[PDB]
Amino acid sequence: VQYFQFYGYLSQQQNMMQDYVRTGTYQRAILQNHTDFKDKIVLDVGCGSGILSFFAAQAGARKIYAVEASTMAQHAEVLVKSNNLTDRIVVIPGKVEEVSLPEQVDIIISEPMGYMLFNERMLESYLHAKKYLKPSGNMFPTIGDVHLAPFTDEQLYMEQFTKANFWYQPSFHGVDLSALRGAAVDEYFRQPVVDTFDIRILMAKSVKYTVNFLEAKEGDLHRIEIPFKFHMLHSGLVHGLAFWFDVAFIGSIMTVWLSTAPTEPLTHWYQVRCLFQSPLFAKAGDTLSGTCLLIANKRQSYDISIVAQVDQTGSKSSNLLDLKNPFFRYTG
Amino acid sequence: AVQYFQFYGYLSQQQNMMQDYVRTGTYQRAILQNHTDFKDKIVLDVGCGSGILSFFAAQAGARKIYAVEASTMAQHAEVLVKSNNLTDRIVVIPGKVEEVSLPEQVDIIISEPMGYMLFNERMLESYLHAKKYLKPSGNMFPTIGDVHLAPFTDEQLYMEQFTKANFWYQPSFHGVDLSALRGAAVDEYFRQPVVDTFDIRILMAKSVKYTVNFLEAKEGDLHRIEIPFKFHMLHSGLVHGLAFWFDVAFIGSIMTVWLSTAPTEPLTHWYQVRCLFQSPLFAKAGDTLSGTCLLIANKRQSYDISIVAQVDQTGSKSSNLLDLKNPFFRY
Amino acid sequence: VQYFQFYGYLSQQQNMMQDYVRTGTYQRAILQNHTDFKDKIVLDVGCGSGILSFFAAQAGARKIYAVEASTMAQHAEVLVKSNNLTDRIVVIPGKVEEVSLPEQVDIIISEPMGYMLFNERMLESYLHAKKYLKPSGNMFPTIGDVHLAPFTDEQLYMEQFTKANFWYQPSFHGVDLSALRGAAVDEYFRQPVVDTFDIRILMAKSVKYTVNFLEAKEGDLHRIEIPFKFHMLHSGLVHGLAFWFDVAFIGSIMTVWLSTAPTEPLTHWYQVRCLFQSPLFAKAGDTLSGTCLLIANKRQSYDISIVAQVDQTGSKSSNLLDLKNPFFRYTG
Amino acid sequence: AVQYFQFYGYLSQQQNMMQDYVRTGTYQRAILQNHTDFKDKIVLDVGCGSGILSFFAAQAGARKIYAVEASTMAQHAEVLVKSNNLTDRIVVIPGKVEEVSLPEQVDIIISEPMGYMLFNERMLESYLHAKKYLKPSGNMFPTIGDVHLAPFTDEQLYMEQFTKANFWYQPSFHGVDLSALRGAAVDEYFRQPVVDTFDIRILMAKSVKYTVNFLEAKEGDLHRIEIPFKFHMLHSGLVHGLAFWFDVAFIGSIMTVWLSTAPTEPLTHWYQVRCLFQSPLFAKAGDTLSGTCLLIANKRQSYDISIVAQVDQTGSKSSNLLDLKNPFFRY
Numbered sequence A, C: 001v002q003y004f005q006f007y008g009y010l011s012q013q014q015n016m017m018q019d020y021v022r023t024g025t026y027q028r029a030i031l032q033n034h035t036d037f038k039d040k041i042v043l044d045v046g047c048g049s050g051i052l053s054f055f056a057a058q059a060g061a062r063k064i065y066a067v068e069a070s071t072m073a074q075h076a077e078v079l080v081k082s083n084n085l086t087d088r089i090v091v092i093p094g095k096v097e098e099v100s101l102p103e104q105v106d107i108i109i110s111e112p113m114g115y116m117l118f119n120e121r122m123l124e125s126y127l128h129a130k131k132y133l134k135p136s137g138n139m140f141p142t143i144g145d146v147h148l149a150p151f152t153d154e155q156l157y158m159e160q161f162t163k164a165n166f167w168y169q170p171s172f173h174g175v176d177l178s179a180l181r182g183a184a185v186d187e188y189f190r191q192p193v194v195d196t197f198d199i200r201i202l203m204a205k206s207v208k209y210t211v212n213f214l215e216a217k218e219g220d221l222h223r224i225e226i227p228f229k230f231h232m233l234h235s236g237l238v239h240g241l242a243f244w245f246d247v248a249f250i251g252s253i254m255t256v257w258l259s260t261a262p263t264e265p266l267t268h269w270y271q272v273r274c275l276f277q278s279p280l281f282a283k284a285g286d287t288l289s290g291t292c293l294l295i296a297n298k299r300q301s302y303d304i305s306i307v308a309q310v311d312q313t314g315s316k317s318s319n320l321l322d323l324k325n326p327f328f329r330y331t332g
Numbered sequence B, D: 001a002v003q004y005f006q007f008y009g010y011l012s013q014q015q016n017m018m019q020d021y022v023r024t025g026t027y028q029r030a031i032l033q034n035h036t037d038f039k040d041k042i043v044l045d046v047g048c049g050s051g052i053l054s055f056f057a058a059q060a061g062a063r064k065i066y067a068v069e070a071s072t073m074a075q076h077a078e079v080l081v082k083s084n085n086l087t088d089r090i091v092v093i094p095g096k097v098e099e100v101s102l103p104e105q106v107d108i109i110i111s112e113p114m115g116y117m118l119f120n121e122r123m124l125e126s127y128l129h130a131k132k133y134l135k136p137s138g139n140m141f142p143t144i145g146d147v148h149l150a151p152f153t154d155e156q157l158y159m160e161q162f163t164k165a166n167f168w169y170q171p172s173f174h175g176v177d178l179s180a181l182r183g184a185a186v187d188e189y190f191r192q193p194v195v196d197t198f199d200i201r202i203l204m205a206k207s208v209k210y211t212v213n214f215l216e217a218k219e220g221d222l223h224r225i226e227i228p229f230k231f232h233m234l235h236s237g238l239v240h241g242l243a244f245w246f247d248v249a250f251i252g253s254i255m256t257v258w259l260s261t262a263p264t265e266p267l268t269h270w271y272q273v274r275c276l277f278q279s280p281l282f283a284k285a286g287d288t289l290s291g292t293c294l295l296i297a298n299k300r301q302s303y304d305i306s307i308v309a310q311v312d313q314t315g316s317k318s319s320n321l322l323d324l325k326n327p328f329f330r331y
């Protein structure tokens, strides 16, 4: 509930700000689309530091309502004063779903993307605020693609068992821990892995899943069924699925893309890998079918259910992951 | 706290404490080498986690061990009690020690309730709370706890933190002035305790110690903890803040056994904790550096931490707040 | 059979030579006992480089027969020539048990000590050569003590399981290896550990076992029964037994000791630890009883059988070790 | 050799080869990615050890795999075949490939018969021997093997080895002259191949490669192996000897896959092998350094290795023997 404490620290805000791909692209998108802003009314949902509102101001917006739920709002307000933008940017402390704007807006801007795009469940707030949009008003970003794909990583699916095996000692300071080995394995396999990777570990082309923020409703995000049918370009043991995302700022003048793909430069979102507990053997030619099912939970996250089978063999694999507790493997 | 008990509910977290040999092994050495403190006795383990301390209790020859765990871990602990044929003797009791009801009074309580700076997490309150089940002449493991503090010089540390805050002194970041929050940035980062280890060379005075005798302290003593100090400086330099570590003593019937987190001793998972002054104090050898640490307990289960210090000679004062909720693990 | 190749390399000879405790003590022992040598006849069994014969020459021996089985003999001969000792030192290529000396000798010198003293089984050659000793002739060294004692080392008994657990992977490149986990554990526990250690890991005073080279027969070394009864000075988990040895040069003038104890400086013999596969819990006061049984085998070594029980509990432990394949844990 | 087969009889030794991911993983990639070379075929694994290559064979869709192991390991391999339900398809056959009798001819032989310098251990002879069970148009894994060699400069190496031998140039060691064997000491140590890795910067010329096509070579070809070379020097310096590494290619029906032990490639358990000259040769850039490696097979299952080299410009020759029986593992 109070993960807003997390967003209160300037250090956390700094982290996002310093992601040049993230913050630069946002700026590019807005100023390169100045007509979507010149003397328009704006809603910045979750402004934090304010940076996005400050960009909307650069592009000529008349009025920008910058809503922030955390105590980061106080510093947003201090910033609007020293920049002398009190005439154009209004900070509103609170949640979008609880505060009241004095006016309908022309465009909504926000950076509500989490790991796997959906993590933190802020996109539901983004959508929630369409209640303030003027009809035919725009949203920045406008759409998001989630990509997923099969990977082969033997060493990653091995770290998992090497770790768990602490619990396979028959005499730790004289205690037999081996009865707990199974539960340890299970814990590590419930953890989505956060780092990047060589793109060569991929075994099929991604399949994408599109959310259009102009059309989608707040409740479309409680249950995200991602059906997949892969056509394996390479033979090997498949150790799980890799996920990444792209967002799109469709402006009047131009479409700008902010991509978090293994191919584009690295961002603070890295990529997310979900291991299978049973590797599937596939060969080039085969189809890897299943569905990835994302079920919104109480801890502002998603229960991930991944069912996959190789159509030719028929051998199958099913895994359940806990997105609120990931493993950050990124070191260098 | 809901998040605190979820934390110790992950096997990975229990494994990490267990994997710390110095900790895990000292406890065993403590328990086993004063077996008389256990042989044929009734034991209480407060927050037994994996169950590891109660097993050591069983090895010493205890008769009955009540192992209270409040996390999910309760269930995993009981599995281990079965697979080890200690169903005999180890009764896993799910819940908080405050809330459960043991059927009996105990000859000795054992526990590992320590956090960074000794007091972090505030489990010593629970540990002392459980004294209500302690018999007269009943021992405790640990028995006492010394907190040590000493002034340090480490400019690299100071710059490292300072330069982070100095992100917020920019005249235009993508054409945006952040300098107004320059102040607030320094405040926040320097509220952070740096957790890592260091070469003892960086220390500039014998440490003052603060002793808490667990046999005698009430739960409410820990609500306000006031640590005065007087450092007789031993080297001239910039004083960049304070380093904190703790020792713990298992005063047994046969032997005392220490578990230390001193920078001079072998490294543990607690590492050491340094706080930083926003601006270093200048001190000469032979000078006196004095002040107090105030540790006010709070709703949210920390720790509002205050450190005022002044070089008496020059009257150079420095006051600091510490946000134990936001450590900077520099390792 | 042809481990004599090993002793052919000058590098291997150098290694022993460079052990200052070993080579210095030998020298000290001989010259400090010059009367045992002045104009006496000597047999150096396994002279290698010759170093010991060269010491006997320094102490005034009339005649020294230096027997060497390996091709190291050729270099021994080259060395006797350049030192100009052809008059006093005779190199005889071959085994003691196969060559023939031209004469009975007054003293036998040799360094036939191996790991745990007995390893390599050269002491049987040392004893074998008593057939050349003049009655009331002496032997250098004269006696050896083997010491053993209980130790506590949790981390050492843990390396063993952490290693074995490679074999506890359910899917290594897709193969389940776990059926072989037991045999892996067994292999590591059959391996005596060679390094040194802090003496504080000891839990009882050593018990010694004495061989007197003046009296012992070649066949007393095929079967070495070492009965032990320890009185635990400390409480803890006992993870096996530590072994080390001492030898004694009992001269007319003086007894010199060459000690390989954890307390004396480190030598190239280090110390040998044998882990139990089941740790025994003991407390100060308790007796740790059992026998260590050393049974000479085909690979010029010893099968070690260690039976131990704690008398108070009655819980017992039995282990079998393979001395021809040790694990050298010594690094720094 | 009795000692060679005892060596691969220890699980620890099999584990060490398996743990080498580059090796173990390249083979898998090789087998699995040209599955057609296996799908529904009859396979021979020569010296299967743990059984690991035959399992990959099974995964590719083979029909019958004859896995010959000569060590104790035969028994452990069969255990794994049972616990994996591949009793179906993997027939463990104890003994040497030379001595056993397979009931059938095979569509493809697979093996990992490589040692340091490719040829060490001499198992390529066994590998090629097994061609007698190979059908016509039958493939082999690996198919070919390139040996690479190139001159290197590394004075630290040269001194390190030299200073060891210089123990034997002492006028009196505990009053004893060893200098007479000074010569013989240098001989011995410099017969040793140094096994470890190195920065590619130390190499002074493009490597010449020596290709052995396994599809075509008879067992007796490997008895005398003569490797001529001509290095067009690329830097002036002291030439301290030669570095040797090998690559191996799995020429499949779908793809070629290389497994390299190049100093430019990721490190493997074979590391790289350098030989040392007793005295370095001096060479200028643009100079030609030429000579030959002679590798004469011998009773005792090595390797008598000869290396003569001369800087043509100056006529500076250097001849060396290499004792593959005595490597100096400098890692």
Ligand SMILES: Nc1ncnc2c1ncn2[C@@H]1O[C@H](CSCC[C@H](N)C(=O)O)[C@@H](O)[C@H]1O
Pocket (backbone or CB within 6 Å): A004, A007, A016, A017, A045, A046, A047, A048, A049, A050, A051, A052, A067, A068, A069, A070, A072, A094, A095, A096, A097, A110, A111, A112, A122, A125
């Ligand atoms: N439901 C909600 N209502 C108001 N603010 C919210 C919110 N959910 C998340 N936020 C805030 O939105 C911020 C998201 S991080 C984005 C920071 C800033 N917009 C930037 O682009 O750099 C956090 O500070 C968070 O506290």
Ligand SMILES: Nc1ncnc2c1ncn2[C@@H]1O[C@H](CSCC[C@H](N)C(=O)O)[C@@H](O)[C@H]1O
Pocket (backbone or CB within 6 Å): B004, B005, B008, B009, B017, B018, B046, B047, B048, B049, B050, B051, B052, B053, B068, B069, B070, B071, B073, B095, B096, B097, B098, B111, B112, B113, B123, B126
């Ligand atoms: N008030 C309380 N009542 C019961 N258990 C508590 C508690 N406060 C903390 N704990 C539990 O006690 C454990 C402390 S960590 C120590 C674990 C274990 N005794 C060991 O030595 O490794 C955690 O599992 C935590 O969940």
Ligand SMILES: Nc1ncnc2c1ncn2[C@@H]1O[C@H](CSCC[C@H](N)C(=O)O)[C@@H](O)[C@H]1O
Pocket (backbone or CB within 6 Å): C004, C007, C016, C017, C045, C046, C047, C048, C049, C050, C051, C052, C067, C068, C069, C070, C072, C094, C095, C096, C097, C110, C111, C112, C122, C125
């Ligand atoms: N049975 C035997 N007959 C002759 N020489 C033997 C032998 N058994 C072992 N040796 C030789 O004795 C040597 C033992 S190492 C001792 C070297 C030398 N005496 C010194 O003290 O430095 C080896 O060189 C070995 O080859």
Ligand SMILES: Nc1ncnc2c1ncn2[C@@H]1O[C@H](CSCC[C@H](N)C(=O)O)[C@@H](O)[C@H]1O
Pocket (backbone or CB within 6 Å): D004, D005, D008, D009, D017, D018, D046, D047, D048, D049, D050, D051, D052, D053, D068, D069, D070, D071, D073, D095, D096, D097, D098, D111, D112, D113, D123, D126
């Ligand atoms: N001539 C021969 N006949 C049968 N097996 C042999 C052999 N020469 C060597 N071997 C065995 O083949 C193995 C080579 S090591 C390779 C092991 C396994 N194929 C892997 O890839 O990991 C050893 O176990 C060795 O004992």
